[PDB]
Design a protein around this ligand. Structure first.
Ligand SMILES: [Mg+2]
Ligand SMILES: [Mg+2]
Ligand SMILES: [Mg+2]
Ligand SMILES: [Mg+2]
Ligand SMILES: [Mg+2]
Ligand SMILES: [Mg+2]
Ligand SMILES: [Mg+2]
Ligand SMILES: [Mg+2]
Ligand SMILES: [Mg+2]
Ligand SMILES: [Mg+2]
Ligand SMILES: [Mg+2]
Ligand SMILES: [Mg+2]
Ligand SMILES: [Mg+2]
Ligand SMILES: [Mg+2]
Ligand SMILES: [Mg+2]
Ligand SMILES: [Mg+2]
Ligand SMILES: [Mg+2]
Ligand SMILES: [Mg+2]
Ligand SMILES: [Mg+2]
Ligand SMILES: [Mg+2]
Ligand SMILES: [Mg+2]
Ligand SMILES: [Mg+2]
Ligand SMILES: [Mg+2]
Ligand SMILES: [Mg+2]
Ligand SMILES: [Mg+2]
Ligand SMILES: [Mg+2]
Ligand SMILES: [Mg+2]
Ligand SMILES: [Mg+2]
Ligand SMILES: [Mg+2]
Ligand SMILES: [Mg+2]
Ligand SMILES: [Mg+2]
Ligand SMILES: [Mg+2]
Ligand SMILES: [Mg+2]
Ligand SMILES: [Mg+2]
Ligand SMILES: [Mg+2]
Ligand SMILES: [Mg+2]
Ligand SMILES: [Mg+2]
Lengths: 258, 185, 184
RNA sequence: UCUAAGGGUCGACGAUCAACUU
RNA sequence: CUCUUAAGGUAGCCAAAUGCCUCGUCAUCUAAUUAGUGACGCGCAUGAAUGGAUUAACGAGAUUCCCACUGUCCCUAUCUA
RNA sequence: UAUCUGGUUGAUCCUGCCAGUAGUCAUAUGCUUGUCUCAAAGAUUAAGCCAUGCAUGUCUAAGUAUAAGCAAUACAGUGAAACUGCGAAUGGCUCAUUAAAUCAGUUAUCGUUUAUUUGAUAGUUCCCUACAUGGUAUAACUGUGGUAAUUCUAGAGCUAAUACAUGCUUAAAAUCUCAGAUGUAUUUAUUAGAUUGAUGAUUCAUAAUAACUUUUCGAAUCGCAUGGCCUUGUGCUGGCGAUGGUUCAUUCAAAUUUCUGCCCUAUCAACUUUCGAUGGUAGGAUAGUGGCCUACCAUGGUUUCAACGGGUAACGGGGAAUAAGGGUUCGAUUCCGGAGAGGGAGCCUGAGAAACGGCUACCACAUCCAAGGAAGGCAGCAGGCGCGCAAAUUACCCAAUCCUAAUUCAGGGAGGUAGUGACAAUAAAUAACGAUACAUGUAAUUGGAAUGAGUACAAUGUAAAUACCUUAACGAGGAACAAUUGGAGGGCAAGUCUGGUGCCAGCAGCCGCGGUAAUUCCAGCUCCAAUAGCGUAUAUUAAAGUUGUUGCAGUUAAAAAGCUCGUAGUUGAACUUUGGGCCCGGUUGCAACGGGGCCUUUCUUUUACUUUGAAAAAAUUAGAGUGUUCAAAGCAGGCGUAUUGCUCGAAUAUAUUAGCAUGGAAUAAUAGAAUAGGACG
RNA sequence: ACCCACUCGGCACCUUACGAGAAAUCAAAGUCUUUGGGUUCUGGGGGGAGUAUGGUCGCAAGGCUGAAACUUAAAGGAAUUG
RNA sequence: GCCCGUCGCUAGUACCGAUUGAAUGGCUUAGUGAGGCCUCAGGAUCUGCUAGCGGAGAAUUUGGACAAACUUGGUCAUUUAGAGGAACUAAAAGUCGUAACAAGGUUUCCGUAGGUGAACCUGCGGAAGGAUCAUU
């Protein structure tokens, strides 16, 4: 329709932003950036709806233009910067670091972390490709290209990214029995261990995941993110650890507060 | 434009307009409970039809089916909280076997009367309409209120509303200002 | 202008399609280059995405490769002798991909002499190292006595502005020689 | 000014010969 | 209801190359139509192999309109044998 | 939330329709209209025509400042104008076109372009400036003007760049050619790319060789700080940044694209094919695939499983109304996709438009004019005309939601706010309680309270208000602060009441009522229904098992073809591992029910079906929680205090057509070895 | 040829109806609200009307296909008593 | 009792119909063809290096493809006029008869054909929905 759209009408925004319906006609359209339009979370949304620090978008940009907010080590003064999964949002005024991770309901949970582990971040290797001059490189889930990767880093593996030098410190290899986050689909926000991978040449790769409670759910390889081995996640998990209690036991946990 | 504003009807007229037995039953209910019009009975029967539909959908499901368990428990909880479903009838079949008077009993216009705060249901209606009744720390001027079975211990007069506190009223002041003259001085 | 859309061009059942969506710029075609010979004239076309194409009109020199010794000398195109798509292109000497042209062959003879030193068409022992196994063919050298080498265009002059190509060799050359000794 | 198609005789082709119609 | 015949003109068709009145009446065609066409029909005096009605094709047959075309005309002029 | 009733007869039972009845975010219209919350609204007819005003502009520290612009030893700040850059392709409107088209779900790009964002990435450039090249350049500005008029511009004099055009500095390392070449970009050819990376798969990524280019890039740019070492000079170095730039990846996208799915119509059965229709080769063109176009060649491609044609008062979908179940109808319209900007067509710029608040032309309209000429496009927001049954203010504002730019600041009729508004929806004032007489109720017999409908200091709210919430004083007695809209024969609740009219006037959806005895008209009284609403008209849904798959009927009520054959379609007998036994282990209450595994002669045809799973945006629907005072709603909120704060949420289900993955192997189809060209190692 | 008994197939018939139907009646018109063996054709109140128009067949007569505007509260079936 | 048709009056709705009728809209052959775009050229004047020679270049201009639009013709669709003709319906207690319902006074009806003011009559074949379930 003659070009790229610059508006995002409310009720067209991604639902996991928990945006109010009758606030205005429009939502913050995620600018082009590292992750995606749908799988992103704008800094305005995370500053005005997930922490209530700012009250308006004006106040969000006021917070942003004095270099308070910081996404993955850099300033990111963009009001609608598309921060996403495994991103580190550190603010030095009110010094605290968050890691954008998915709760078990499928929203971007507010997950405070410490500087000693916010130093780095994780990245799912989107592709391994030889660049110009025969220099190998890896592309990660957040759109990062890292040259001279370990010759044993393949697709669907995860790499620990320094986030200050932007290099690969370690890498977890996709295989049966490693801890995986689910970053899309019905089970978006669950954590489990890889049990089996169905190949489906041509079609879509499927993976069967068994959470701590021995629940076994299958999902597409596109949205599973290796985060370490069982019991040793290379990152800190949010308050729920992706267990996916049913509504009955959720109501039970709720009524356990009398 | 802004997202649409959801709205629903709350009542349903009867299919037969001039059924004399239904008319007499509606007038009996309206006289007993001090109702302004047949639309209040219509609204209560609409709520009851929705409740009955949900209960029927659940009862057709298998027992210990998670959806039936969860939603029937929620419906029964809501009904016993409102006081329509009694304490010993938490089975989802008594939900089906409920009635219009079970909802008309929990009306604040009925509770105010049954608590002696009013001389009749019409006294209760005017007393709620005139901001005289407070449920908690909150004046409630709506006859249809569906007391939560905990507000029952708290339905009393307001600090306003010169039957339960500070002020003496409005016509009392003018009658005092004219009784000053009526005294002669 | 010219449109490459399929909203015209009635469907496979034969039904005539109703029109919607007035012609879109992302479906435009353009005019053929009809590259001629001589006095190079290249025009820059602005294409989608800010890119540039080069319409070759009247091209004089092309880069042709022998493909047997891998030289790719730059030479002069004499004329078009065969075109599989239109004899009118041969008549008009219109330079075009897959056109069979004739090239000067003088740079190729000079390279053959500076490389093998073996009197093709009329630092000492490099000619010895490139040993007696230098017989090219009985049809690629008989053309050197006339100084015209049969070649096939491989670039697209209307698209890239260049008229590069390769010298005919082997069964391709036999095929085109049969075609030429028929149609000539 | 050209292009194409449509033949005879002789020994998948080769040699030779020939008239116009499109 | 009459008088009346061998039978009382049927099916059709018409101001028709058959209708006096008559340039019939209505419509169409035109600026204007005794023309043409379509209808109407108590039709001087239409009508059934003295053939009625109709008909594709055909016609140096009679007729009306239209397009083209033009010295037929407006309005004549000029050239050749 | 599975209902019927009146009307054919003297009466009956049916068929059957008409009529009634109920709903409609479904429109109009009539009457009436007190309060709070919510808020549809020129779609229908004329994608008809439009006066006027606004709707797109934009600056940081960080492109260019000698404003004769302001203000307290080159400007040090601000800064009009202008050049430059970016944007103006988003938004908003409308539904005219459009029926395999759009669109929906699902695919592909190993078939391409992609400004921007994000990340990575460039020691190789020279055939007498690099301690920095030119005007070949110009704007704004200064002065001279033409025209009636335009966001018209000529003529002359300067002036810069991150505008324009050129153009060097980086050794060392480094191999091939016979000292030179060797970065990248373009084009071609060849080579490797294995079994030395990837993919299911490549002529992929990538590298190499030989060359090739009307030269591509390889900063001649800017801000704030100035630091360290020192031949103390115009030294050498060194920050944090901004902007720019090649390529790759990423993102926002785009364009094509797989499969399946659109309403009525046969009084549309053949359609397409010279003039591209289907395919092949080659080319051209495109960003790229492709008959997209061209040349040559072949004669194909669609179709009763409905092609092609015609109609649509047809934009598609999410969804809406109604709904026992199944369905019927609707969907111009809050979100997604498409298309258009009076009708066509063409094109500039740009990453992106076949753009119309851009241009060019024609057609139809139509403005101005000094007659020479010039300027247009409300289906943006208001507003006018016209059309109509049918739809609001030429209002305020960027505070919210977001968007745009050079950007924290400016702009935004996008949007919000208010005005109109009985579209629709929510809650629910018009009275309540005593005394006296009479037999719990009757009376213009009377008393004390209560309140908001209003009105209004303030204060909250708001961008500034308005209103709502909260309230000082006022503001109830036939509380005239007076409720209506339709009815009273039946259907259908309610009158042999009174007066009037006399087959008239009229009523009456239908049956009927009215002709001097009217329960039916006109009224009065009384009564009934719903009620701030009620009636009427049209449409549609239920009623309708009167469209019937569930689920109709066809002897006589409408309906079995005159009869038989017969293609498509639909449908089609039975039969192939059953039955013992041993285990492990689940879920519910030793039992029941469900599995999985072994033995018992026993451990990769094609489909349908079905289980499970992923998918099927949000809104909507069902629905969990939550005292918006209740409610419609909304996604909030809750818990304690004198903190310098703690905490739960914004679930879940369904869309069962098509595709995908998985378990089952009954049902139904299909294939196996018969001239053995069969199986086994 | 006939008689008796049985049997298959056929034209029918008599009685009774579990059953069906509005009934007349029906061994199918039954096995139908306890509604599904397969399949073709037809009807949707009465007229206008098997009309007009178009198509097609026919020598013609006509056949096949086949509306609409408009109109109407009945028309119709079986049976009962007069 | 019920009832049928012609004819006559009134009103309404459709139909046929000379007029090579009319209007509007869609599609389209042919002709002409604006405009931009690509292309063959062209060279005002605008500066540069030395009459030698280059660069930028407006008007104009050739040929193409894209093509609006107009004219003519064809075709389709939808409205619409029309002398006259021929129906249907409604109303009307008009005229003529009495065709059907009883064996309706000739049983009725179906197909077909012919005839007659009108219902109708008649021939041929058929049906009972007949006025006969019946002659071993
Ligand atoms: Mg006669
Ligand atoms: Mg005559
Ligand atoms: Mg005549
Ligand atoms: Mg004449
Ligand atoms: Mg005779
Ligand atoms: Mg005669
Ligand atoms: Mg003759
Ligand atoms: Mg009805
Ligand atoms: Mg309109
Ligand atoms: Mg848009
Ligand atoms: Mg490659
Ligand atoms: Mg090709
Ligand atoms: Mg529709
Ligand atoms: Mg339309
Ligand atoms: Mg729509
Ligand atoms: Mg419309
Ligand atoms: Mg839209
Ligand atoms: Mg457009
Ligand atoms: Mg308009
Ligand atoms: Mg346009
Ligand atoms: Mg406009
Ligand atoms: Mg626009
Ligand atoms: Mg408007
Ligand atoms: Mg009142
Ligand atoms: Mg108030
Ligand atoms: Mg009355
Ligand atoms: Mg009654
Ligand atoms: Mg029926
Ligand atoms: Mg009959
Ligand atoms: Mg019948
Ligand atoms: Mg068959
Ligand atoms: Mg079988
Ligand atoms: Mg009928
Ligand atoms: Mg009868
Ligand atoms: Mg008779
Ligand atoms: Mg008779
Ligand atoms: Mg008789």
């Amino acid at each position: 329709a003659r070009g790229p759209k610059k508006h995002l009408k409310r009720l067209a925004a991604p639902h996991h932003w928990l945006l109010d319906k009758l606030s205005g006609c429009y939502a913050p359209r995620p600018s082009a950036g590292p992750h995606k339009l749908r799988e992103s979370l704008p800094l305005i949304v995370f500053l005005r709806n997930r922490l209530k620090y700012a009250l308006n978008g004006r106040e969000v940009k006021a917070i942003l233009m004095q270099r308070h907010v910081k996404v993955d080590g850099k300033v990111r003064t963009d009001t609608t910067y598309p921060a996403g999964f495994m991103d580190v949002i550190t603010l030095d005024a009110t010094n605290e670091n968050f890691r954008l991770v998915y709760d078990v309901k499928g929203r971007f949970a507010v997950h405070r972390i410490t500087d000693e582990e916010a130093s780095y971040k994780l990245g799912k290797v989107k592709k391994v490709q030889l660049g110009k001059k025969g220099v190998p490189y890896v592309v990660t889930h957040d759109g990062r290209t890292i040259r001279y990767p370990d010759p044993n880093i393949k697709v669907n593996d995860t790499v620990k990214i320094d986030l200050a030098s932007g290099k690969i410190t370690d890498f977890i290899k996709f295989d049966a029995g490693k801890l995986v986050y689910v970053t899309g689909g019905r089970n978006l926000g669950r954590i489990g261990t890889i049990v089996h991978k169905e190949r489906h040449d041509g079609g879509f790769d499927l993976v069967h995941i068994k959470d701590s409670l021995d629940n076994t759910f299958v999902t597409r390889l596109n949205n599973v993110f290796v985060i370490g081995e069982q019991g040793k996640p290379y990152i800190s998990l949010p308050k729920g650890k992706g267990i996916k209690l049913s509504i009955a036991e959720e109501r039970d946990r709720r009524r356990a507060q009398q | 434009p802004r997202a649409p504003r959801t709205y629903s009807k709350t009542y349903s007229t009867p299919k037969r307009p001039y059924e004399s037995s239904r008319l007499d039953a509606e007038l009996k209910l309206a006289g007993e409970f001090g109702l302004k019009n047949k639309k209040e009975i219509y609204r209560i029967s609409f709520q009851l039809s929705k409740i009955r539909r949900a209960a029927r959908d659940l009862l057709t499901r298998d027992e210990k089916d998670p959806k039936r368990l969860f939603e029937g428990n929620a419906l029964i909880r809501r009904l016993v909280r409102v006081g329509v479903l009694s304490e010993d009838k938490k089975k989802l079949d008594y939900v089906l076997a409920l009635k219009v008077e079970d909802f008309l009993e929990r009306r604040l216009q009925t509770q105010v009367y049954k608590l002696g705060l009013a001389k009749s249901v019409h006294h209760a209606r005017v007393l709620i309409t005139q901001r005289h009744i407070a449920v908690g720390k909150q004046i409630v001027n709506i006859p249809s209120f569906m007391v939560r079975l905990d507000s029952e211990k708290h339905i009393d007069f307001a600090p306003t509303s010169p039957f339960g506190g500070a002020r003496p009223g409005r016509v009392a002041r003018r009658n005092a200002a004219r009784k000053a003259e009526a005294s002669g001085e | 202008g010219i449109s490459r859309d399929s909203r015209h061009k009635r469907s496979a059942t034969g039904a005539k399609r109703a029109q919607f969506r007035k012609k879109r710029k992302f479906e435009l075609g353009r005019q053929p280059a009809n590259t001629k010979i001589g006095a190079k004239r290249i025009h820059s076309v602005r294409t989608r995405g800010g890119n540039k194409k080069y319409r070759a009109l009247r091209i004089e020199t092309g880069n042709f490769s022998w493909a047997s010794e891998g030289i790719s000398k730059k030479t002069r195109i004499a004329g078009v002798v065969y075109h599989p798509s239109n004899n009118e292109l041969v008549r008009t000497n219109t330079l075009t991909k897959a056109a069979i042209v004739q090239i000067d062959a003088t740079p190729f003879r000079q390279w053959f002499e500076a490389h093998y030193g073996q009197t093709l068409g009329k630092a000492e022992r490099k000619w010895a190292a490139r040993a007696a196994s230098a017989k090219i063919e009985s049809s690629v050298e008989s053309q050197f006595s006339a100084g015209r080498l049969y070649a096939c265009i491989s670039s697209r002059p209307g698209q890239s502005g260049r008229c590069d190509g390769y010298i005919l060799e082997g069964e391709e050359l036999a095929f085109y020689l049969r075609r030429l000794t028929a149609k000539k």
